[PDB]
């Protein structure tokens, strides 16, 4: 799906860095601590997703390369796709499957420099509009797994997991719209109580008082019906999530059961045992249940490219083997860009990139069979 990445002037990169020839199946980027294999993912997120939305001077200086007093002007990331049919905004010289003019270089400067659309400076809205109709979303919790997210979902308590499920549904289009009608409720209440009492002082204004009473009845109707819409969406998505989680966990661990009980707590075990939530767990099965939940969150809405920054932190031979086999089975539908230090997702993947560390600049090379050499030295 994604074809080649061109990175110039970004945080730890040279005058131009081209990474090419990765098939739509699973591809793995390796390196060492300080190479930039998590900075390549921050080069991908800089264009497609909306982490770097609108930035002040310190965030721009964090993006732009501070490379020994050279090339501090700009940073640019181009991402080339390939597709039989893909969405677009204006024709703009349609290349033969080379839709890179729509995912443009994303040029930032020290000042607010505005980027283009094949030599025409075009807003972010057209980019997110074509990515709207390309089957993506610019604020998904699954298309970005940065450094520290899986350790965050192993120390998040039950209400924070329910809020992340609520943002998985996107049901705050039924909640913050209900908060706008809550603004309406407070202002309408403390305005028109005074209005109807002064009208009852004068009392044809009782007609105005009566239809403001029925307007408050309409406020009641809309708030209970939108609470009904919220629960109607949330429990259907939860009926999807609970069973996706059951299937994913019974595929990872072939000896246990795992549900979700909504009050979020996760009643599971490893054999014929009792229920234990995330207070009473080893870190190994805590990160197993965290990645099983996120591999359930993918299955409510599957996308075409995923990013896995150390999705197998420090588990085990059996757990990395199960996660590698499940990711190989899942790579039949979408791109799976990943990062590893251990060879269990190297024996099963297809493409292997190595980020060569130097102490200010870095570049990516591609050989395939020197990687297990690089890890089993």
């Amino acid at each position: 799906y994604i074809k080649r990445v061109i990175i110039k002037g970004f945080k730890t990169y040279r005058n131009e860095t081209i990474i090419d020839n990765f098939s739509p199946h699973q591809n793995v980027i390796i390196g060492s601590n300080g190479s930039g294999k998590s900075n390549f993912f921050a080069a991908i997120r800089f264009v497609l997703s909306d982490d770097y939305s609108n930035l002040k001077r310190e965030e721009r200086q964090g993006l732009i390369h501070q490379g020994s007093g050279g090339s501090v002007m700009s940073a640019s990331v181009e991402i080339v796709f390939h597709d039989p049919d893909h969405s677009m905004i204006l024709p703009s010289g349609v290349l033969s499957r080379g839709d890179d003019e729509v995912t443009i270089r994303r040029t930032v400067g020290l000042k607010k420099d505005d980027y283009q659309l094949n030599d025409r400076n075009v807003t972010k809205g057209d980019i997110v509009r074509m990515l709207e109709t390309a089957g993506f979303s610019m604020n998904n919790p699954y298309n970005i797994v940065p450094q520290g997210k899986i350790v965050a979902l192993t120390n998040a308590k039950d209400k924070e997991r329910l809020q992340l499920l609520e943002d998985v549904v996107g049901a705050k289009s039924f909640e913050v719209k209900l908060k706008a009608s809550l603004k309406k409720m407070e202002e309408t209440e403390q305005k028109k109580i005074q209005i109807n009492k002064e009208m009852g002082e004068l009392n044809d204004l009782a007609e105005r008082a009566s239809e403001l009473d029925e307007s408050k009845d309409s406020i009641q109707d809309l708030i209970v019906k939108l609470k009904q819409q919220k629960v109607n969406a949330v429990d259907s998505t939860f009926q999807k999530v609970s069973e996706n989680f059951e299937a994913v966990f019974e595929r990872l661990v072939p000896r246990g059961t795992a549900k979700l009980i909504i009050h979020i707590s996760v009643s599971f075990n490893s054999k014929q045992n009792e229920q234990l939530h995330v207070e009473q767990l080893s870190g190994g099965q805590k990160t197993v249940c965290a990645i099983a939940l996120i591999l359930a969150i993918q299955m409510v809405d599957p996308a075409s490219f995923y990013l896995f920054d150390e999705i197998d932190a420090c588990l085990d031979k059996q757990y990395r083997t199960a996660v590698a086999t499940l990711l190989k089975e899942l790579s039949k539908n979408a791109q799976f860009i990943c990062t590893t230090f251990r060879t269990d997702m190297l024996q099963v993947a297809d493409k292997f990139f190595r980020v060569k560390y130097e102490c200010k600049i870095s570049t990516v090379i591609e050989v395939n069979r020197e990687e297990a050499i690089g890890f089993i030295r």
Binding site: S32, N33, G34, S38, C314, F341, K360
Partner: protein
Amino acid sequence: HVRKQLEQTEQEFEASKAKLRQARESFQAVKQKRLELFNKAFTHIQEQITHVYKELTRSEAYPLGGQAYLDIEEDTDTPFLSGVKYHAMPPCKRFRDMEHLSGGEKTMAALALLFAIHSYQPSPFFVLDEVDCALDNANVEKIKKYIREHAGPGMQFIVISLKPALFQASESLIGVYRDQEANTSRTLTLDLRKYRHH
């Protein structure tokens, strides 16, 4: 009628001023005690953080290592009420913001801070969880070369580790396996002084 009222109000005002001086000099005494007890620990960790970071970031390719120091933002009268910023700069690396660092470099700076905090009041033992499992093989080897050079009489190291590059060099192994048919944990131990290097 007003003169003895004046003197009684004046003298209970003076008694309130005297107990004000009492509580105020007691406050300066407990403040100076808190200040000295904080300042000696601050000076000790500030002098040892540089050496522990140089020991954690040197290698064969770069023998001098990085440099780290922690310092008060606003040193006016109370360092214990101000924040301490921890600057940790690895080899060939310099920033203005510290959170631009890697996963392994953050883990190295964190382990250097813990080792420098620990040697203020040195406990007879030191116990470590799986802090190694966000690191590559070079940083795990530097952890092993730091621990093997420091573990001895007066400083015992008990690490919980999964990486064989770290626990292959211990003096003894405690292997804990879960017997599942009885639903218990069990321990075995092994002496690694019976075996050779290389």
